Amino acid sequence: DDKWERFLVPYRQAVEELKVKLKGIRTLYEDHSPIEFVTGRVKPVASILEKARRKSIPLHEIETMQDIAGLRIMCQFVDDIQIVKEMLFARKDFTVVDQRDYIAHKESGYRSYHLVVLYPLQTVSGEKHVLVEIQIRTLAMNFWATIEHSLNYKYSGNIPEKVKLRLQRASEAASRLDEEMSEIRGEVQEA
Amino acid sequence: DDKWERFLVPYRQAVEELKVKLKGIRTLYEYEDDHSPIEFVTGRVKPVASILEKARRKSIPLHEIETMQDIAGLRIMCQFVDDIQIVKEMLFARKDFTVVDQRSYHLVVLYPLQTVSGEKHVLVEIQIRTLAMNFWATIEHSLNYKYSGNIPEKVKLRLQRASEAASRLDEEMSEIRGEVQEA
Amino acid sequence: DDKWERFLVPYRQAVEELKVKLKGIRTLYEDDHSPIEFVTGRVKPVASILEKARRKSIPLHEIETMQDIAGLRIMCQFVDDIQIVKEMLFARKDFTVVDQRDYIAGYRSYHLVVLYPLQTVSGEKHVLVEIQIRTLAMNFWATIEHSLNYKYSGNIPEKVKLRLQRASEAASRLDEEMSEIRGEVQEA
Amino acid sequence: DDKWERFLVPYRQAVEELKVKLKGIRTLYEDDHSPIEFVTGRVKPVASILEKARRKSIPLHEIETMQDIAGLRIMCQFVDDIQIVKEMLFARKDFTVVDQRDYIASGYRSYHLVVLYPLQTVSGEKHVLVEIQIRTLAMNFWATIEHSLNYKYSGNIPEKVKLRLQRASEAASRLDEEMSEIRGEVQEA
Known about the structure:
alpha+beta, Beta Polymerase, domain 2, Helix Hairpins, 5 helices, GTP binding (chain B)
């Protein structure tokens, strides 16, 4: 079982390196920083196994899983997301290998931009390329998604319809808040 | 002004001590693992510039700065409106400081800081807000800064609209929470 | 096994709170000489708790009496800094000192034990926390001694044991020359 | 003076990124003996850059040629670890080594190398020089003290204090020698 913890060591180190890197973006800006804060997480073994058994994964290719390592970048404004995206695409300390835009959204109201990078981790024995998922979200998107995640866990994937209807209303309310915020930003920018 | 950096030392330490304390609440829950009434905690000591400036707009003599309740400040952000009362009650029950005032919900605590030369009781303001309110409030504060306290009418309208949208979001979240708890 | 990590939660939080407090001392000083160089803290792993419980025959219902489930280490530059730190700790009002032992007066270290009034969700929990105060040279020697004793399962060969003893004497002489540097400057 | 802190921002970020990288080495090892005990990093204060800026003949036009505005220190338990860390650093591909100087071979002992770190910024890449020193714990202790004394006495320690500092460097060296023999003995497994 520490074969697991030995397997996850590079993923954890990739996340810590990328956290300090991405947090440097906001520091460099202190005008308006396009990043409010940054979090990162390596998937717990249980959650790796559960998803592997839910999506057809024999345990020998789990290394194909794109989100064992994950970061989340939270932005104040919707337009900040495109800015962060472009910064990430320009970085030379990793390469972007995949992306998908749920901002351009899901049936329940999930809003988030995803990309996956291949991070060239320097190890004791040389280089190891590890997949790291990076999501970019507004604060309001992140708030809604966090609640949805908690409810799906609490109800084991079967949220009762009365709660699901309200969750869907909350996603629209979060979306409207982001729209009003966008109007504020655009109006300030017509400087 | 090294006079300043020395004056602010206790305030900064009180904030760091209180941050680790309050962040421990969430930790206590999420082993548990049910719902933490705290989502996150931030803290800041007011910059020398902003202390002086506020001192001069409500007419405060330089020997009366230590009376200011918000040189040191923390902010506690909660998911749900109902969490705010839960956090409030937790803070009133803690024995490692005393609550001396209250009125976003804010309270002020007196923190018995241990220093090398003995004790120093320092005032620290604690604001408790929902995430949605914090988001609006951060933008309002920034605009108030950018426009030096006189926000233009075309921006203030949009800020009011954002405030209403934040309110609607908190209301839906509250309804979600209300449905879940009657389990 | 989930019972264990819930049991250790208060110990971890006590350590994190004490670390930030004790690191504040150096901050308060930094112009002058800080009696503290750095601060570390650790909660003993369940494995190590159980094993010590079995060597000093502690019923699992009595483990909470163990003084070093939670531990901090304070490292100082000079031997004289240790007395200064000791006095600071005895004067603090955010905990109470309940025990101490001085191996400075080849293992060298000062130990004390405090009772920390941890604020929890359900009220107060008083937790025992061991605080060791050491010079850098002392901590270095003790760290090596601990590692070897682990590698050799408590039975260090005589050829390694002789060198470890000479090393503790070298560490002690290093501290002595450092003390003389301090004693002279101080005689300003 | 705000030009100073904008100037130092990349240096600070380079140090923070390299700290997390180098601290990952020990983690990777824990199980086994880590050749690294701990890692610190520092950007030089404006005052100290300027003072060094030409008591050592450097125009502020070319401050960036200074190799130690950004600095890291790697502390090892054993003298033999230093060579291991050195070889690890030369093998890394996330920077390039551009200079080195060896005082393992006043009583000062330390191995130095200088790397060029390709910092990703908002405006593209910035290559910054970062000095990395590798020291035993006992060496680092002594050097920390000398540096503090050199500050107290504005760069010329009086000799009655300097003599003892030399005796102290010799005491640290002897501690390292016994530890080396211990390491040297255990490995003969």
